[PDB]
Amino acid sequence: MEQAPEDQGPQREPYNDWTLELLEELKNEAVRHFPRIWLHSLGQHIYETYGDTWTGVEALIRILQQLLFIHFRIGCRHSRIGIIQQRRTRNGASKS
Numbered sequence: 001m002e003q004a005p006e007d008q009g010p011q012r013e014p015y016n017d018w019t020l021e022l023l024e025e026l027k028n029e030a031v032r033h034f035p036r037i038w039l040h041s042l043g044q045h046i047y048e049t050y051g052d053t054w055t056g057v058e059a060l061i062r063i064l065q066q067l068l069f070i071h072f073r074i075g076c077r078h079s080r081i082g083i084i085q086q087r088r089t090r091n092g093a094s095k096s
Contacts, residue, residue: 019054026061030068039064 003014031039042060043052050056074080087093 023057023061026065030064033072034068 002011004011027039042064046052046056046060050059085091
């Protein structure tokens with residue numbers, strides 16, 4: 001059943017609305033910090049794999065969150081001012 005209160009009003013689907021809002025929240029959170037667009041492509045792939053099942057949606061967010069968390073942890077510690085490459089200038093350089 002839904003989140004039925006005492007005075008049951010016209011409560012049009014709490015879940016599968018709120019759910020999509022929480023998703024949207026975690027998505028917004030991630031894309032703000034991680035303007036990758038990959039997010040979208042992973043969803044498209046997940047429509048092949050799952051069929052955008054709430055299973056695949058939650059799964060995606062979990063994996064994405066985790067993935068973020070690593071780069072976010074690193075991001076907090078390490079300055080990493082776009083230091084994607086091992087060296088700032090050119091990889092290897094000396095004592096690779």
